[PDB]
Swiss-Prot record, chains A, C:
L-methionine binds at residues 55, 98, 233, 264. It holds the Pfam family S-AdoMet_synt_M. It is an enzyme of class 2 (transferase). It catalyses: L-methionine + ATP + H2O = S-adenosyl-L-methionine + phosphate + diphosphate. Changing residue 266 to N/A: Loss of activity. Its EC number is 2.5.1.6. It comes from Escherichia coli (strain K12). Its cofactor is Mg(2+); Mn(2+); Co(2+); K(+). K(+) binds at residue 42. It is found in: Cytoplasm. This is S-adenosylmethionine synthase. Catalyzes the formation of S-adenosylmethionine (AdoMet) from methionine and ATP. The overall synthetic reaction is composed of two sequential steps, AdoMet formation and the subsequent tripolyphosphate hydrolysis which occurs prior to release of AdoMet from the enzyme. Is essential for growth.
């Protein structure tokens, strides 16, 4: 039952990821002063301008231009030869700030907006994530690590990766194609770039046993990649949602994460759905689990909760849905309380995926033991 | 930023202009070979625009959202569990009369009557008045509604937006092509 | 009766002059295709963006971004180290284009808008212009000439000049102060810059007999000037009207020139007022002449015509006003007909003054002989 599956990822220098980081950098700055703020930030990045817009309900004061320039400068855009300069780019702010207002049960607050959220978890990997998306993130993350520490000074922030895994009876048996498009300077020649990228990025990351002679490598297939970033293509917040969550391995609700405060179910419930999906798999209840949570605006309780185990469940499916409702409080404020999301920790989550990194509140498997005991699996 | 087109090899051997993933889906669940929940979700909002424009309900306004929760059983739909229809109106109409009109003129003509039982829950403007909406209510960007465009949550998505892209970009044409081959296989 | 008079000028790299050149570059591009177009272009220049806006009534197609980038590139902003890059700057267009419509007397068209226009001319200089403004323009024009031809490669586009002339009984007897602020690169040291600027710019331009020991030179009085242009300060179209026309020597109506088609009396009538003022002085009727023309929107004939000779007239003042009405057709379309303004020649006029350069249609003294004969001065 061999079949090829492909997943891709982009580096922090990609225009669609610059907007995500800028939006979350604004969110983190606000959460430091007013944790209970309401933030919905949308960022548009063009060849020489950054447009930051959205609606904010807070009592905090932030300098949008300073935050934006620092975020871009940390990425590594410092002069116009790269195609974008942090110190000499227009930063327009369309943010509409309001004033917070001032006795019922806080956990009974209805959802601020309707939407669909999907959570996924599989025992395929150690971090309970799909394998193809994890290694796609490793390549671009390795590219940024190598560029910044000075191993390859001629690299530039923009980079994209794409790995095609060859499954067989549900198990990975090799890698069929690796694509690594990276932005460089005009100093380096094309032939030497491919040798350096292959030896210094692809080799240290991917397991050697998967890379056989049949594996095809496409390192900058077109040619020179000198001018990139915002000049090469426009960037908008939430255009890279699939590469953030799971790649193509799991269904997605369609709600962007970056630039949204935890009070919006479009972000917190997706984290919560991943939280309950990871715990179910970590508890041994199922090899793969997919959770769908749906909210109606102005209504506290979710309109629907769906658990799907793809016929890999150790307990009857209707029993799992009872366990999810019993243990996890899925009301919009209950998600914040059970995950402690009111902290400025969202700058780091907008770079190489919101899931799979264990230092996040929603990546903790603490209720796994409780679920296993409740299901009576000993 | 407008540029100028340039000016002998095989045209079919042109490489892809950019990398990406494209997913195509098709199921014999519906007549048009599409997931059922997304089709009826589109019907409600499409009916809302049709009613507003032809003058049946002059107090409606363009912004509207719908959400239908279907109850499956052994892979077959047996009913509808929840219907949500948030619509923008004018300040002229009162809240109570809006719910009666929307329920009778939008939800009733669209959804099959046998699915709407007494256990079905209707949420028509659950918050309250919805007068000022559209761009003022929230920002809008191209490609932020990709999931509602293709299939809803029933199928996986590659993550490439469609609107504003010419057919030469595989982020749009290949998604259409993937749907084309998926529909033919099921058909 | 000694008194010091000061006039200043700015180079083509100044942010307020970049907007003027960009606006007129758009105007010239439109006039090449549709000479009878209606153009009112306003340009806003910021640290990393150029906003081109206005209302156009034409059937012509122009690429605003291409025109803007070419205009800035010709000025000499090519990389971000100068503070502004033509190839990597945002060019937003807010231009609202309409469609021209499709039998009365063309010369009876009323003025499209009301306004005041002032024309001035004095026999103080050869080109019939105030002396202080002419030499102020020479210094900045010399700075651009030296920078471009490669005599001083370390110069940069932004530059400002200011010359203080010492009059005595209405005649210039010397120069009391010269100020020349110029943008340079970090390569050149401050001490060597002053020696080079003084020897290569101030010396070749100003007459040697005026520069005495009492003359004070201020060459970059603050210090280093490396980052300038749009980053240093914002630029808007029509913020440098006084340095365009005459400096402080003559009154001004307050209407900007750049970005306006000839059909608007805010520009053509100012050219026409200068035209009649130059001819009156060139005919020997007066040593100094000042003309004010006022239009009411929707009315053809000017609401008021004023001639002022400051008591230097060789003929009675009330006779001069009759001569102006007799010879010069001051109706809004009559100005275009008697000056041939429907040509793309306005890119050159937005750099170092609209007046005093003899290759312009309004700088021709052709009716001077006719006026002298009519006044009966032989």
């Amino acid at each position: 039952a061999k079949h090829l599956f492909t997943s891709e990822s982009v580096s922090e220098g990609h225009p669609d990821k610059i907007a995500d980081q800028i939006s979350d950098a604004v969110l983190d700055a606000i959460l430091e002063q007013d944790p209970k703020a309401r933030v919905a930030c949308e960022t548009y990045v063009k060849t020489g301008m950054v447009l930051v817009g959205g609606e904010i309900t807070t009592s905090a004061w932030v300098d949008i231009e300073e935050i934006t320039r620092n975020t871009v400068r940390e990425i590594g855009y410092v002069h116009s030869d790269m195609g974008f300069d942090a110190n000499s780019c227009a930063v327009l702010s369309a943010i509409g700030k309001q004033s917070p207002d001032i006795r019922a049960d806080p956990l009974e607050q209805g959802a601020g907006d309707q939407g669909l959220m999907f959570g996924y978890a599989t025992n395929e990997t150690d971090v309970l994530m799909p394998a193809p998306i994890t290694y796609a993130h490793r390549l671009v993350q390795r590219q940024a690590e190598v560029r910044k520490n000075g191993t390859l000074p001629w690299l530039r922030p923009d980079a994209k990766s794409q790995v095609t895994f060859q499954y067989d009876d549900g198990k990975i048996v090799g890698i069929d194609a690796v694509v690594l498009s990276t932005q460089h300077s005009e100093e380096i020649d094309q032939k030497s770039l491919q040798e350096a990228v292959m030896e210094e990025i692809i080799k240290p990351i991917l397991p050697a046993e998967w890379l056989t002679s049949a594996t095809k490598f496409f390192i900058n297939p077109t040619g020179r990649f000198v001018i990139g970033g915002p000049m090469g293509d426009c960037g908008l917040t939430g255009r890279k949602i699939i590469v953030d969550t799971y790649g193509g391995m799991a269904r997605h609700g369609g709600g962007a994460f970056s630039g949204k405060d935890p009070s919006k179910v479009d972000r917190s419930a997706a984290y919560a759905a991943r939280y309950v999906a990871k715990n179910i798999v970590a508890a041994g209840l199922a090899d793969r689990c997919e959770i769908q949570v749906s909210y109606a605006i102005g209504v506290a309780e979710p309109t629907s909760i769906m658990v799907e185990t793809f016929g890999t469940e150790k307990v009857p499916s209707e029993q799992l849905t009872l366990l999810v409702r019993e243990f996890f409080d899925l009301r919009p404020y209950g998600l914040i309380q059970m995950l402690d999301l009111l902290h400025p920790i969202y700058k780091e989550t907008a770079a190489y995926g919101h899931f799979g990194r264990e230092h996040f509140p929603w990546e903790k498997t603490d209720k796994a033991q409780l679920l296993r005991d409740a299901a009576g699996l000993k």
